């Protein structure tokens, strides 16, 4: 199965919703790909939420992101596939961490808030 270290793992419905929102954010120029860009967004406090994969090997290369999310008060979730997450980001290469940035006046704000509420009530 999946690594137990990724405890806030989303189910199929939330996985589909998260991938759809990630694709929409990519279309709106509101997404950052890669763990390094996710870390940069977290340090600058311009991240709505962080989506990271559960197939990263080793998973410890992105387990620092939950700590930064807790420090910066940003929701985070784990998806079951690093290949579908990359495809949602618009990149054929697998992506193990994507960050949805904050853009004032964006039409995705309501969907972003709904996804944040869904994620923040799923970790435990």
């Amino acid at each position: 199965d999946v690594n137990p270290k990724a405890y806030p793992l989303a189910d199929a419905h939330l996985t589909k919703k998260l991938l759809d929102l990630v694709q929409q954010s990519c279309n709106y120029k509101q997404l950052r790909k890669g763990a390094n860009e996710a870390t940069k967004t977290l340090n600058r406090g311009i991240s709505e939420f962080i989506v990271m994969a559960a197939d990263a090997e080793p998973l410890e290369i992105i387990l620092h992101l939950p700590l930064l999310c807790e420090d910066k008060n940003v929701p985070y979730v784990f998806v079951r596939s690093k290949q579908a997450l990359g495809r949602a980001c618009g990149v054929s290469r697998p992506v193990i961490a994507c960050s949805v940035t904050i853009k004032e006046g964006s039409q995705l704000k309501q969907q972003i808030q709904s996804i944040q509420q869904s994620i923040e009530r799923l970790l435990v």
Binding site: S81, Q83, A84
Partner: protein
Amino acid sequence: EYLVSPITGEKIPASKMQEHMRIGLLDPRWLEQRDRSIREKQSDDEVYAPGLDIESSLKQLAERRTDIFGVEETAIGKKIG
């Protein structure tokens, strides 16, 4: 772990997403270009002499050039010594 194919509508195991997508969108222009290239490089006549012929030519040159090769030195064109 079957993901629906966005190009054909079928289902492939997730272990073969990237390869199926790369192969699925492979232009037949690549096939015809490769066939053309295969036809060209397997039909051009060799321009330079083969290796044994090169060695034989160099041996003849050494025989007829004693100012460069050999022990004794005859004239430029002579072969006796």
